[PDB]
Design a protein around this ligand. Sequence first.
Ligand SMILES: CC(C)CN(C[C@@H](O)[C@H](Cc1ccccc1)NC(=O)O[C@H]1CO[C@H]2OCC[C@H]21)S(=O)(=O)c1ccc2c(c1)OCO2
Ligand SMILES: [Cl-]
Ligand SMILES: [Cl-]
Ligand code: NA
Lengths: 99, 99
Amino acid sequence: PQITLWKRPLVTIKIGGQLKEALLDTGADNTVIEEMSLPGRWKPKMIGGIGGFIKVRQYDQIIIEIAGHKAIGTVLVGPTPVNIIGRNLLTQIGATLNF
Amino acid sequence: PQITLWKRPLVTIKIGGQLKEALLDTGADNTVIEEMSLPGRWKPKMIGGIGGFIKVRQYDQIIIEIAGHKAIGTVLVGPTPVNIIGRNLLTQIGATLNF
Ligand SMILES: CC(C)CN(C[C@@H](O)[C@H](Cc1ccccc1)NC(=O)O[C@H]1CO[C@H]2OCC[C@H]21)S(=O)(=O)c1ccc2c(c1)OCO2
Ligand SMILES: [Cl-]
Ligand SMILES: [Cl-]
Ligand code: NA
């Protein structure tokens, strides 16, 4: 698709068996999802934005379906106000910014 | 241009006759720049990011060049970690997300 930016670029994702809404976010290095369980190992991380930092759990090699496109990568889980698909997964579905 | 996302989508902006670097950020509703002087009156605004809320100064109808494209619109000034170009100006330069 071609997604305009008059409104937030929200899409449906599937992660850990669950359907969620998430923001396609070119300003995010990393993918950050609201608290949920995921399988496998994790390690703690701090990530920072407007407002400061939050502590997250870093899960590696997680499969995510993003508007019908499968990708794998690292997913951070923690108290983000919104689910964010960052560049680490946008690259894998071939997303570009065009103007 | 068609900008891929393997690296941060940083562009040159020009505001108040000065060049700065800024991040093209589809996850930002608003454009937020680091402290600088801008003409005119400002109004209060609170914006919520990953770590919580901050107060910013809202300046309307500011001339700003983005990657060589002319925009005139709202610029928020405050303690953002990076200059961010949000959807209010990404729409003005005709940007879309494509995959
Ligand atoms: C601030 C930029 C450099 C980084 N952020 C991504 C943004 O797209 C963020 C994504 C975001 C969106 C909504 C709520 C929280 C974060 N948007 C945001 O802060 O926008 C603010 C300005 O416009 C307003 O509209 C949205 C909130 C305001 S982020 O959420 O802090 C973030 C995401 C993933 C990360 C990261 C930081 O560090 C490493 O991986
Ligand atoms: Cl990754
Ligand atoms: Cl590519
Ligand atoms: Na893992």
